[PDB]
Amino acid sequence: GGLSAPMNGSIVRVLVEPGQTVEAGATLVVLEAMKMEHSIRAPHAGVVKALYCSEGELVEEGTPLVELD
Amino acid sequence: SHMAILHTQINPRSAEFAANAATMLEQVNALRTLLGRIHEGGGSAAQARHSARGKLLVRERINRLLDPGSPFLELSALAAHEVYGEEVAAAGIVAGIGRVEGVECMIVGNDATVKGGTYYPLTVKKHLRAQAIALENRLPCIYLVDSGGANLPRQDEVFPDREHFGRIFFNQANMSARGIPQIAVVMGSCTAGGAYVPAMSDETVMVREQATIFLAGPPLVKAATGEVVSAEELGGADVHCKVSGVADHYAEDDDHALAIARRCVANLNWRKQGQLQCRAPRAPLYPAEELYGVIPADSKQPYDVREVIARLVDGSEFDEFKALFGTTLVCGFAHLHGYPIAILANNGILFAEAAQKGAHFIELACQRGIPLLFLQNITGFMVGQKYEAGGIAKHGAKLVTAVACARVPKFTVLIGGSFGAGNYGMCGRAYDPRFLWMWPNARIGVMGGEQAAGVLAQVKREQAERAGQQLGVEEEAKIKAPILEQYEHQGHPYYSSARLWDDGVIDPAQTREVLALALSAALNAPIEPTAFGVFRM
Amino acid sequence: SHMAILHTQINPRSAEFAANAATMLEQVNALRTLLGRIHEGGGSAAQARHSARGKLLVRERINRLLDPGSPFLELSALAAHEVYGEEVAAAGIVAGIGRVEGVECMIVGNDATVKGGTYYPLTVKKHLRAQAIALENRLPCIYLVDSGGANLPRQDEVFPDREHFGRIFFNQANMSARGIPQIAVVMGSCTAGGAYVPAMSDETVMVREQATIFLAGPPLVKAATGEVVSAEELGGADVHCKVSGVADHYAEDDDHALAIARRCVANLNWRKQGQLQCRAPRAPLYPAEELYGVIPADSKQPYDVREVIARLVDGSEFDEFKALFGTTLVCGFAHLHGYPIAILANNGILFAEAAQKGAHFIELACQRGIPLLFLQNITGFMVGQKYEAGGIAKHGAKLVTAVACARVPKFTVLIGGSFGAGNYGMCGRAYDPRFLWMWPNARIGVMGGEQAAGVLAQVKREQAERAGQQLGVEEEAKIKAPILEQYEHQGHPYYSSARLWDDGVIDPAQTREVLALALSAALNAPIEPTAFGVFRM
Amino acid sequence: SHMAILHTQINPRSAEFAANAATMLEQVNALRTLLGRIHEGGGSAAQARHSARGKLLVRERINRLLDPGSPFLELSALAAHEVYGEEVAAAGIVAGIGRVEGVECMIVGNDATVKGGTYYPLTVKKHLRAQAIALENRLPCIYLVDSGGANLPRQDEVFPDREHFGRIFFNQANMSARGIPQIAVVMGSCTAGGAYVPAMSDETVMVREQATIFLAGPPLVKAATGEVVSAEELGGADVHCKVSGVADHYAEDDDHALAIARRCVANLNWRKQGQLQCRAPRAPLYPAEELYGVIPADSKQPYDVREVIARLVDGSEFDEFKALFGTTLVCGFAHLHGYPIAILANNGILFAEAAQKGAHFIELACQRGIPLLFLQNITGFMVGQKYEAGGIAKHGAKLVTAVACARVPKFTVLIGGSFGAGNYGMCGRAYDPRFLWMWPNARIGVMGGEQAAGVLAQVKREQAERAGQQLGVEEEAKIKAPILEQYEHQGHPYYSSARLWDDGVIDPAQTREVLALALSAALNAPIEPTAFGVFRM
C-alpha cells in the first residue's frame, strides 16, 4: 500500500526508484507545501511496486504517489 | 455676563486686514483644490473601471451609509501626499466620523481604485489612527472593507512591528472587548491581510458575487498545492454566508449591504457616557470668517490671540485666569456650542511664569472635568543665562506633567507654529489629544530653518577650530544651504498631514464648527478623573 | 511525575546532528562577533576622546551601577544596524534590565561617543521601547543622560508624531503617576530636548563641572539676543544644585554619581506585585546547547518542537493539552525556573483544529493566571478551497482574539519563521508580548521570497492578459528578480533587530536563561484578570 | 426601516389556518375555565365561612391593595393541580406582580380557605419562587399573611431541607439587607412557622381582633405546661402593637390594613435601577390573535417561527442575524413595547451550526446589555455517526455556557416542545430566566413518549439477549405500554405548571403584553455585566 501525498503540494525529489526494495520508512516521495518539505516515508517495510510522480508533478491531497505491492 | 466679553480691536475694513485675509483665503483655496484632486481616487481612469464592476465608489458608499444630511469629519485626507513614489490618494482609505442611526461613528473604507486598495505603510498608519480616536472617544466602528492586501513591495514597513498591520486586529478585538461594537461590510476582494477585518468583528456583511474573504486568493492558492479555483468558489459571498460562518448578513449589492449595516448600528442599545454641564448654545459675536484677516501674513508678526478666541467661543464671552501674569500664555474659561471648555493659547514667548500659570490652570480644569483646548503658536522658550538659572527648565517641566497627565478630553489646533519644547508643552501630537488639527498658515518643526542650520554649522567650525583650522564662509555656507531648505519643506502642513502628525489641515474659519463636532463625539466616552505624577517644585 | 517527561529521540552523536549544530553555532559566532563590534560605540577614536574628558564610558557606567555581578539583559543591541548611512552603534543608547539594590531595573544611558549621543530616529524608538518594558512590567527607571540633542538632519522623524521624542516625557510623567519612580543621572551635555529627562524625574543627579542641563546651550543662546557665556555658567552642575533646583543631588564624578543613584533606588520601599505559585527550580533533563543540533540547517525541513521544549522546561516535564488534535500546534503546561508557564509552539502548518486547540488553551492559562510562551515556527495557514469554506478564516480569528486579549504576561521567541497570519496568531510584535526574541536562524516576513514574487508577478500578467497580451518570461523574470532578493534581505534577524521588531537576537542555547530572567522581572507588576472580546463561533 | 419588516405568509382565511386556530382556541378556553374553578379557593363552602368572620378574601385583598386598575401578573395558578390528594387551589397561595403606589411589587397572600391556609409542600415552593422573582428583579415585597401552619402530615416535605420552609426567612432577611423592603400585613392567624414572616419584616401591620402572631397558639400552649388562654390575649393585635412591638401599624380591618400598607410603599423613596435604550412603543403589524392559527394543530408539523415573531415585536420589525446559517435556530434583534430585545427562536432540529450561531448571538446581546428572549420548540439535537464525530457535542456546549453565564435579563416561553438537550440550550427552567412561561399547546419532557419507550425496552432485550434469550412481542409490549402514557401525562402544561416548572401557562395571544410587563418590572433591577466561563472551542 502507501500514503500517496499525505497532503497536497509539489514534489521536488522522488528517491526510491520504480522497483527497488525499501527499508523502514524510506522517504519514497518528497512533497513540499507552502515553503516546507513534507517527505512521505514508508510505514510498512517492503518493496516499491510503481511510483507515478516525476519531480514537479504538483498533485493533490489524495493523488496516487507511490505504492508497495 | 456683559463683562466677560471680548470687544474686538480689529478693523475688518482696514487695508492691513484685507491684506492678511487675502493671502490667507488664497491658502485655503490652495487646500480646497488639492482635496478636490484627492477625491479623485485612483483617477477617473481605474475609478470608472470600478463602477464598471457594478461597485459603488468608496466616497459614495459613505454618503449613503450616513444619516440623511449628517455632517462628516474626514481624517487626514492629505494622507500620503507626495510621499510614496506614485500618487496614492488619501492613502487609499477614507475615514471619518459621522452620524449613523443617531450614533456618532467611525467609518473606515478602502479605495479599491487606489493602487488596488492595497495597504501602503501610511495606509496602515491611517487605519490605526482611526481606531485610536475610536477607542479613545468610544465610537463604534464600521469597516467598509474592499482591499487587495498589503503593498507587497513595501512589506517591511507594513507587516512586522507593533505599530504595523495586525495591530489592526489587536485594536479590533480589544475594542470588542471594551464594548465598542465592531462592524464589517465586505464589498470587494479581501485577500489574506484584510481577511481578518471581517472575521474579527461583532457583525459582518458580504455583497454577493462581489465580496470574497479568503486567507489565500487564487494567486497564492495555485502557488500552494497546485489547485486552480475561481474566487467565487474559494471564498465567495455564498460560501461564507451559507457554508462556514465567516459572514452574517447576505447582501444583494453595495446599496443593500450598506442598508444592512445601518440596521446593525440600530440595535446597538447605545448610550453616551461622557457628561458635562453643557448650556444654551449661543453663537460668537464676530463672524468666524473674519479670522482670515486676524492672522498676520507675516509669519513672525505679533498679533493678539484673544481675537481668535472671540471668534470661536460662545457669545464671545471668555473669563481670563491670571489675567496679567506671564501674559505670554492666555488662559481662560468659556463655552463652545454649549460644551464648557478651558483654553490655553499662545501669545508669544514663554517664560517660566507662563508655565506655572498654565500648570495651575490645567489643575483647575482637571478638577472640574472641563475639556482642554490648546491653541499653538509657540516659537520657543525664552532662553538666556538668567532665564536658565531661574528654572525656566523645571517650571516648563511642571507644564508638561500637567499636560501629559490630564485625563479630561484634550484638543489641539495649530494656528501658528509648533517649535521645540513648545509643541510638547501645548499638548502636541505625542500627548494624545483626542484630535489635533493644523491651520494652512501654521508651520511645525524642531526649530527654525536657519535656527538649526545655525547650530549644526556652528559646531562644524568648532570641531575644526580646536582642530587647528577655521571654516571658510565657503563650506559653512554650503553647510547651511541644504538644511535651510529642508526645514522650509518639512515644516509645511501638507508634509505634516501627509504623514499623519495631524488629523488634518482645516479651514481656519471652520474651526469653531469642527471643535463642536469633536467635543460632542468625545462625549460618547466618559470623562475620567485625573492623576498627577510628581511635580518638580 | 516520571510520565510528564519528554524522552528525546535526538542522537547528540549522529552525523545529521553535528551538521545542524554546525551551521547553528556558526550563526551564533556571527552574532557574537558583531555584538562585540557594537560594543565599540563611536569607535576607538572619539571613544578615547571621551575618557579624556574624564567621563566613564557608557557600558562601564552601567557595570558600576549594577549590583555586584548582577546579570544584565540588554535590549536591541543590533539597534539601527546598517540602517542609517553612517554607523550608529546600538543606536547611540544602551538599555537593559539589571539588579540595583535588589530591584530589577530598567536602565537607559546614551553613548556620547556615537555621533554625539544625539537622537537618530531609532534612538528615540529604542528609548521608548524601554519605557514600555518599564511600564508594562513596572520596573523603576534609571536614565543615564549624556546626549547632545536630536539629530537635526533627520528631525522629521524624531520630533513631531505621537511616538517620537517628547513621548519620552509623556511616558515619564505617566509612570511617575503610576508610582514607578523616575530617576535621572546627568553626566554630560543635556541640551534642549533631553533637557526634560532630568527636569521631569522624581529624583535628579548631576556631575559637577561636566553635567549641564539647559533648554538652549550657548550655540543657540548666542543665536538668541546675542549674549555670550560658557556652558557651566549657563546651566552647569552648580547652577542647578545650589540655585534653580532642577537637580537634587550634587555628584563629584561619574563614579560618585552612580553611587548616589544606587542610594535612591535604596529608599524606594519597593515591593514586587506579581504573584504565581512558583515551585523549587529544577534544571532541564538535557544540555541546553544540544539545541544547536535540534534545529535543522535545512530551512524548511520539518522537526519536532517538543525537542526544543524539552531543553527549556524544568526537569523536561511537559503536560500536553489536546495532545493528538490539530497536531500542527503544540500546547502544554510546565515550569521554567520555578515559575509555572503555558506553552504554545508551532509544529507545522495551522489548520482550523490548531487554532481552536490554541484558543481553548489560552482560555485555560488565562483563567489560572499562568504566563504564556509562544514559540513561532509558522509558515502560514493551510490554504485551499475546502480549508477555506471550512472557516479556517474565522477559526484563526478565535485564536487572535484570545491572544490579543490575554492579560497574563506573554512572551515570544522566534525559533523558525514568522510568515503571514502566522506571526499574528502566535503573539507577534503587535500583540504586546512583554518581551519578544529572535534566534539567529529565524526568518520573518509577510510571506516567502518567491511567494510574494509569485503573486506580485502573476497579477502583472493578468492585467496584461485581459489587456489583449501576455508577459513573456522576459519581463516576468525581471519583475520577480528584485522581489526575490528584497525578501531574502528583509527577513534576516539583523534586519529585524536593527529596526526593533524584536528586543534582540539571542543565543538559542541560552533561551531558558533569558526566559526565566524576563519572567521574574515581569513579576514586578501584577498579573491582571483577562477580558475577552467577542469570539466568532 | 421598511425592510426590517416581516411580510406575513399566513392567510387568516385559509381552511388550514382556521383548523389550527380552532383546536388552539379550545385549549385556551380549557385553561380559562380551569383558572375559573381555581379562583374558588377552598370552595364556596368555607369560602363563605370565611367572609363570616368579616375578613375579605385573598383575591379581594389583592385587588383592593392594587393601584386603581393596575394590571396583575399572577404566578403559577395551576399550582398543585391534581397533585396532592384533595384539591388545594393555586396551592393555597396566590402571588403575582402589580403596581402599588407606582412601584411594581411582588405580593404574596394565603387563602385562609384552602385547607386552612396551611403550607403544603408546593405552598412553600411557590412562596419561595415568588421571593426569587423578588430578589432577581428587585421588587419590594408585600406579604398578606393569613395562614394556619405548615401541613403537619406532609412536614417531612416542608420543614428540614435547604429550600423548604424557613428559607422564607432566609430569603426575607437577605432581601432587607440588599435594600428590597419587606412588608407584612397580618389579617388572620399566624402560628409558629408563619410567625416569623411578620416578625422579620421592615414594617408590619395587624388587623385588630382578628390577627394573631404567636409562636405557639393555644392548642400547643395548653399542651405546654397546661395553661388555658384565648388567641387574642396570647398574641392578638392589641398585644403586639401596644405591648411587644412585634407589629408597627394598628389596623381596624382588612380594608384599613391594606391602606396602611399602600402608605408604606409610598414612603419608599424607591427608584428603578435597570437601564435600557427604550424607544417609542409601536404595536405589531398583525393581530396578536392571529397566532391561534399560526401554530399547527399537528404537534410534529413543521411551521415557520418567524411568524410568531412578527406577531410579538414592535411594528413586526426583526433584524435577523446569521440570516441563512444553521437555520434550525432563528436569531435577531427588535423591540417590544419599547424595550429592545434579543430573540433566539427554534425552527427545527439544532445541528452544530445552530449552537455556534446562537452562542455568537448571546455574546452580541450580552455585549450590548440587551435582554434575551427564548422561544422553545426544540425536538432535540441532530444525532448520527458523522454528526457526533463532528462535535455536535462540544458545539452544543458552547451554546449552554453562553446561556448559563449571560447576566442580562433572560425570558423563556415554551411554544412547541421542550425535549432533552434542547431545553437546556434554550434557557430552560435550570438557567434562571427571570420568568419562564408555557403555552397550552406546548409539551415538556426528557424525550418523546415512545422515544423513551424505545431505548428503555431495548436494553431489556439486549441484557436478555447476551443472556441466551430474547424478549418476545409479549413482554416488550408490556414494558413499553406504561411508559408510552406516563410521558404523555407528564408532558402536559397543567402537569408542568402544577409543579412550578413554569411560572404559569398563558394565552399565546397575550404573549406580547405579558412579556412587556415582565421586562419592565425586571428593570427595577440593574442589568449586570456578564463574565463567560471557558468556551470549549
Ligand SMILES: CC(C)(COP(=O)(O)OP(=O)(O)OC[C@H]1O[C@@H](n2cnc3c(N)ncnc32)[C@H](O)[C@@H]1OP(=O)(O)O)[C@@H](O)C(=O)NCCC(=O)NCCS
Ligand atoms: C487584489 C487583486 C485581486 C487585484 O484585483 P483587481 O481589482 O483586478 O486589481 P488589479 O489586479 O488590476 O491590481 C492593480 C494594482 O494592484 C496592485 N497590487 C495588487 N496587489 C498588490 C500587492 N499585494 N502589493 C502591491 N501591489 C499590489 C498592483 O501593483 C496594481 O498596480 P498598477 O495598477 O499600478 O499596475 C490581486 O492583485 C490579488 O490577487 N492580490 C492578492 C494580494 C495578496 O496576496 N496580498 C497578501 C499580503 S497581506
Ligand SMILES: CC(C)(COP(=O)(O)OP(=O)(O)OC[C@H]1O[C@@H](n2cnc3c(N)ncnc32)[C@H](O)[C@@H]1OP(=O)(O)O)[C@@H](O)C(=O)NCCC(=O)NCCS
Ligand atoms: C552637543 C555638542 C555640545 C557636542 O559637543 P562635543 O562633545 O564636542 O561633540 P562634537 O561637537 O564633537 O560633536 C561630534 C558629532 O556630534 C554630532 N552632533 C552634535 N549635535 C548634533 C545635532 N543636534 N544633530 C546632529 N548631529 C549632532 C555632529 O554631527 C558630530 O558628528 P561627527 O562626529 O560624525 O562629525 C554640540 O554638538 C552642541 O552644542 N549641539 C547642540 C545640540 C542642539 O542644539 N540640539 C537641539 C535639538 S533638540
Ligand SMILES: CC(C)(COP(=O)(O)OP(=O)(O)OC[C@H]1O[C@@H](n2cnc3c(N)ncnc32)[C@H](O)[C@@H]1OP(=O)(O)O)[C@@H](O)C(=O)NCCC(=O)NCCS
Ligand atoms: C389554623 C387553625 C387556627 C384553623 O382555624 P380555623 O379558621 O377554625 O380553620 P379550621 O380549624 O376549621 O381548619 C380547617 C382545615 O384546617 C386544616 N389545618 C389547620 N391546621 C393544620 C395543620 N397545621 N396541618 C394540617 N392541617 C391543618 C385542617 O386539616 C382542616 O381541614 P378540613 O377543612 O379538610 O377538615 C387551627 O387549625 C390551628 O390552631 N392550627 C395550628 C397550626 C399549627 O400549630 N401549626 C404549626 C406548624 S408550623
Ligand SMILES: *C(=O)CCCC[C@@H]1SC[C@@H]2NC(=O)N[C@@H]21
Ligand atoms: C525658534 O526660535 C526655536 C527656538 C530655539 C530655542 C531652543 S531649540 C528647541 C528648544 N526647545 C525650545 O522651546 N527652545 C529650545
Ligand SMILES: *C(=O)CCCC[C@@H]1SC[C@@H]2NC(=O)N[C@@H]21
Ligand atoms: C510562506 O509560505 C507564506 C504562506 C503563504 C500563505 C498565505 S500568505 C499569508 C496568509 N496567512 C497565512 O497564514 N498564510 C496565508
